[PDB]
Amino acid sequence: PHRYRPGTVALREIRRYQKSTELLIRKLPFQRLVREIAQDFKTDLRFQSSAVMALQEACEAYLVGLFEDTNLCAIHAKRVTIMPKDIQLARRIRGE
Amino acid sequence: HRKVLRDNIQGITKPAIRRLARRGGVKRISGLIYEETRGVLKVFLENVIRDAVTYTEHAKRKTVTAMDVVYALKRQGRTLYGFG
Amino acid sequence: GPQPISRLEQCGINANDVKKLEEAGFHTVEAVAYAPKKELINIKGISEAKADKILAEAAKLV
DNA sequence: ACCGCTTAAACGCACGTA
DNA sequence: TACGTGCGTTTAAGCGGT
Numbered sequence: 001p002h003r004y005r006p007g008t009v010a011l012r013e014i015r016r017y018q019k020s021t022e023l024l025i026r027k028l029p030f031q032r033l034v035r036e037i038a039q040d041f042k043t044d045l046r047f048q049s050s051a052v053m054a055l056q057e058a059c060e061a062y063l064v065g066l067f068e069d070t071n072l073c074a075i076h077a078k079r080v081t082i083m084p085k086d087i088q089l090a091r092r093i094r095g096e
Numbered sequence: 097h098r099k100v101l102r103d104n105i106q107g108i109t110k111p112a113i114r115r116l117a118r119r120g121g122v123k124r125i126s127g128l129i130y131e132e133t134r135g136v137l138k139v140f141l142e143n144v145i146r147d148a149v150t151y152t153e154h155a156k157r158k159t160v161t162a163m164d165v166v167y168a169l170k171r172q173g174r175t176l177y178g179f180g
Numbered sequence: 181g182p183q184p185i186s187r188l189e190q191c192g193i194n195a196n197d198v199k200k201l202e203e204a205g206f207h208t209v210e211a212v213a214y215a216p217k218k219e220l221i222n223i224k225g226i227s228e229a230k231a232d233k234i235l236a237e238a239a240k241l242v
Numbered sequence: 243a244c245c246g247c248t249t250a251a252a253c254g255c256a257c258g259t260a
Numbered sequence: 261t262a263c264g265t266g267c268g269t270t271t272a273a274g275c276g277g278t
């Protein structure tokens with residue numbers, strides 16, 4: 001039976017998702033998360049649809065960029081695998 | 097009348113985080129990344145939403161608008177185009 | 181009788197805020213309950229939102 | 243907010259190897 | 261030795277109506 005070697009399909013996915021623009025997190029859980037977080041700041045809140053979509057576009061753009069920097073940190077350490085310490089270095093240097 | 101308390105962050109699933117990382121150009125991913133990512137996401141969301149709601153409250157509204165979010169993002173140096 | 185502040189934790193007050201209330205010296209839901217907002221706010225690491233959540237959930241419990 | 247149906251994605255596991 | 265790949269199962273996201 002056929003099996004691709006470790007890495008081939010990963011690269012295929014990179015090309016695939018860098019080619020496209022669709023949101024990568026599921027709508028409903030993201031919305032649920034947003035409402036949960038919002039509740040600890042202000043009671044009785046409602047949300048415009050486009051407000052939740054705005055938050056998702058912003059969040060996903062942020063995470064993708066962070067993963068770019070994280071990847072650079074992993075490669076810097078002569079690895080190809082990203083690890084929490086890569087994220088933490090990236091966020092420290094960003095001033096986060 | 098009642099509506100129940102909930103916990104959500106785990107709804108941002110492993111394959112979703114993987115897709116985000118792929119778009120970020122990542123080829124291989126440690127198992128510990130996912131939880132880490134979730135924490136990071138939560139912090140981000142919290143900050144933005146905290147500001148957004150502040151704007152909402154100033155306008156004496158109960159509905160967070162797209163503009164509330166846009167202003168929060170702008171004032172955090174993360175300008176977003178497309179939702180004005 | 182008493183309502184130990186532990187039960188407040190199931191209402192969804194985070195456990196760190198309950199530890200801050202015990203450090204302040206509040207050990208029961210009775211203790212948080214019959215106090216105004218400002219008592220909990222003056223405690224280190226407690227915002228006005230957490231104090232409102234505590235009083236509301238304590239009024240649910242008490 | 244809810245009901246129902248569908249199906250594709252998630253998940254658990256086995257295994258080999260990078 | 262931990263992670264990628266593949267496969268069978270199950271779970272829930274998605275879509276459509278109201």
